[PDB]
Amino acid sequence: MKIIKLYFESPVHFGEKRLSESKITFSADTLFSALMIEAVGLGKEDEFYQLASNNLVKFSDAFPFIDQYYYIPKPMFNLKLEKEDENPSKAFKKLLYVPIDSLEDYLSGGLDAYFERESFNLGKLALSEKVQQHDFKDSEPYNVGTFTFKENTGLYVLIEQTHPLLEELLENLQYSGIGGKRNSGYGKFKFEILEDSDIEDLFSAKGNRKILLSGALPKDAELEQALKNASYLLERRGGFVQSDTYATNLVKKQDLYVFKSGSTFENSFDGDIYQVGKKGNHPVYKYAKSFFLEVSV
RNA sequence: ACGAGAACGCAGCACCAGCUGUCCAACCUGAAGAAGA
């Protein structure tokens, strides 16, 4: 609908559990954490939480885009309707991201397996050997896993009904970086809200199977409804609370397990914004609302 | 309230030691002060 295209001017660290490795995309909870930190910066975190918790600003995570080819993580189809031909094997296993316009072609079969992966080339992971210099003690060598994008390549975020407050927050997020070592020379980007036309048709479509496009956790009421004929995958969303005004020390947060952003469901559920920091003096939130892409097998 | 925050790939270290721009080789060859002053 409103593809937010992020163009990075420096390698990024989007780490999953440790500093030595980086991954190529950031999730929607990472982006909501960044925007909430910005909103606390300019004093309107309450309105941002109200907007996001009232579904007025719901977004997917960051997917790759290459030369105006919007990519999506390989949807978790049950592949019950492809054993007749093609390769129902590890051929469709190294394939990580498929284009979002060619999903119905992929879903019905006929998309090349080998061709896509070499076609899908956006930069490469990098080592960044660093140290903590000590005058008389020994220096502390550490490395930061980073990732540099190509020239005409970056990440894109699906947002429904962009908001003036969200536009104000994304301007502030340009100059504070996104990702791991952003205060070091890594997090840096410029964005374009970039309304799009061939994409809004995919989300105005209909179909039996729904593709989850944001790492989401169902409410306790609809977990049973969503966990029926579903092909999902959990992932722990924890780590350390990034704030200088929380718990007067460096404390971890309650690990949250959410459905991955490639899972497929027959029942649409609306996730929740989860309180994962309670013992501290501000609400640490895990954005886990649901963003879907309905298809028909 | 971004698997986070904080963290110099940094410190010491002579592009240096030995080595004739030397050896051989002729500034050499060929050539009248006459003639009617």
Nucleotides of B under 7 A from a protein CB: 1-10
Resolution (Å units): 2.8
Q: Do residues A233 and A262 touch, judged by C-beta distance below 8 A?
A: yes
Closest CA to A262 of A14, A55, A31, A25: A25
How far is Cα A86 from Cα A91, in angstroms, rounded to an integer? 9
Q: What is the distance in angstroms measured between the alpha-carbon CA of A140 and the sugar C1' of B15?
A: 32
Nearest nt to the A275 alpha carbon by C1': B1
The Å distance, CA of A144 to C1' of B12, is: 27
Q: Which nucleotide is nearest to A134 (CA to C1')?
A: B10
How buried is A28 (Cβ within 10 angstroms: 0-12 exposed, 13-18 middle, 19+ buried)? buried
In order of A63, A87, A98, A108, A262, the CA distances from A112 in angstroms are 20, 10, 10, 12, 20
φ, ψ (nearest 5 deg) of residue A43: 75, 25
CA atoms of A55 and A75, how far apart (whole Å): 24
Distant-in-sequence, close-in-space partners of A166: CB < 8 Å, separation ≥ 6: A35, A48, A51, A57, A159
Reference A63, options A74, A53, A54; nearest CA is A74
The amino acid at A20: S
How far apart (Å, rounded) are the C-alpha atoms in residues A45 and A36?
A: 6
Residue A256's alpha-carbon distances to A6, A26, A275, in angstroms, are 27, 16, 10
Q: How far is the CA of A107 from the C1' of B25 (A)?
A: 96
Q: CA of A104 vs C1' of B27, distance in Å?
A: 101
Closest nucleotide to A49, Cα to C1': B1
A30 closest-nt by C1' vs CA: B2
d(C-alpha A212, C-alpha A61), whole Å: 10
**How far, in Å, is the CA of A114 from the C1' of nucleotide B25?**
80
Q: Which structure tokens are listed for A192?
A: 């374009």
A214 in Cβ contact with A28 (< 8 Å) = yes
Tokens found for residue A12? 């990024």
The dihedral region occupied by A247, where left means phi > 0, alpha psi between -120 and 50, and beta the remainder, is left
Task: Report the distance from CA of residue A44 to the C1' of nucleotide B24 in Å, as an integer.
Answer: 98
Which tokens in the block code for residue A275? Answer: 């309180």
b/e for A190-224, b at 16 or more Cβ within 10 A? ebeeeebeebeebbeeeeebbbbbbbbbbeeeeee
Nucleotide nearest to A139 (CA to C1'): B10
